[PDB]
Design an enzyme around this catalytic site. Structure first.
Site: not given
Length: 256
Positions: A8-10, A43, A183, A206, A209
């Protein structure tokens, strides 16, 4: 068989300054030359993390929490909001003087230009006010919407749109999401197309979500300072993104 890792990114790929760690680039590197498939599950909207994909050379991903899945440059699966419902929401929000921002796989558009709530909230994200197109949803696939109103006002929206979910991210703005979808269901559709098996899938997350995701994959990796409820459902807790978390974790997991 083949192994795959979803990021995931963040707080995972990007650090707190939203920069890409040198060790992560190395990590992804080793992972590819090792035959391990690399992908993203977030997301976020596609156009919102295009730079990350370009930097890491990742063209397979689950976006919009599973409502838009792309496999090697092609659309594997897409489930946009119901047109009829986006309209009703628009008209209803309009009657209340509440603006909306429509998001499709490529961009955003506001139903009202130069609006105070969009300015402040969007700027908090480090984004300019989106261009104004009140009827952008008419001939476009809207996967998500942003409702610009205060919490003391979301009551009717929540009440009149059970098929939607609302997650506030700012004093004057809340995400309007589809009820169905996840997801995990996106990650699932791709491993089926890839011929990969649940047990052979890894995932790094992280935020709250990511629970659904970390729970579903064979090996879910939570991160350093992730929420306590994210670590609970995780199969492994690595260091923070700030401390080579992705690299160290992939190492401990013997993937690299």
């Amino acid at each position: 068989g083949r192994k795959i890792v979803f990021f995931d990114i963040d707080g995972t790929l990007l650090d707190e300054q939203k920069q890409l760690p040198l060790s992560t680039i190395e990590a992804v590197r080793r992972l590819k030359q090792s035959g391990v498939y690399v992908a993203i599950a977030t997301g976020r909207a596609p156009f919102m993390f295009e730079h990350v994909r370009k930097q890491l050379g990742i063209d397979s991903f689950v976006s919009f929490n599973g409502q838009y899945v792309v496999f090697e440059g092609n659309v594997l699966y897409k489930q946009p909001l119901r047109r009829e419902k986006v309209r009703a929401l628009t008209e209803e929000a309009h009657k209340n003087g509440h603006p909306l921002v429509f998001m499709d796989a490529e961009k955003m558009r506001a139903s009202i230009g130069d609006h105070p709530h969009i300015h402040v909230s969007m700027a908090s994200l480090k984004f300019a006010h989106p261009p104004v197109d009140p009827l952008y949803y008419e001939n476009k696939d809207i996967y998500q919407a942003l409702l610009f109103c205060r919490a003391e006002e979301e009551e009717p929206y929540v009440r009149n749109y059970p098929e939607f979910r609302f997650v506030r991210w700012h004093d004057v703005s809340t995400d309007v999401l589809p009820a169905g979808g996840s997801k995990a269901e996106g990650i699932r559709m791709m491993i089926e197309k890839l011929g990969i098996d649940k047990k052979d899938v890894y995932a790094f997350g992280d935020g709250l979500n990511d629970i659904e995701m970390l729970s579903f994959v064979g090996t879910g990796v939570a991160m350093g300072n992730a929420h306590e409820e994210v670590k609970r459902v995780a199969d492994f807790v690595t260091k923070p993104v700030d401390k080579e978390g992705i690299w160290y974790g992939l190492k401990q997991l013997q993937l690299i």
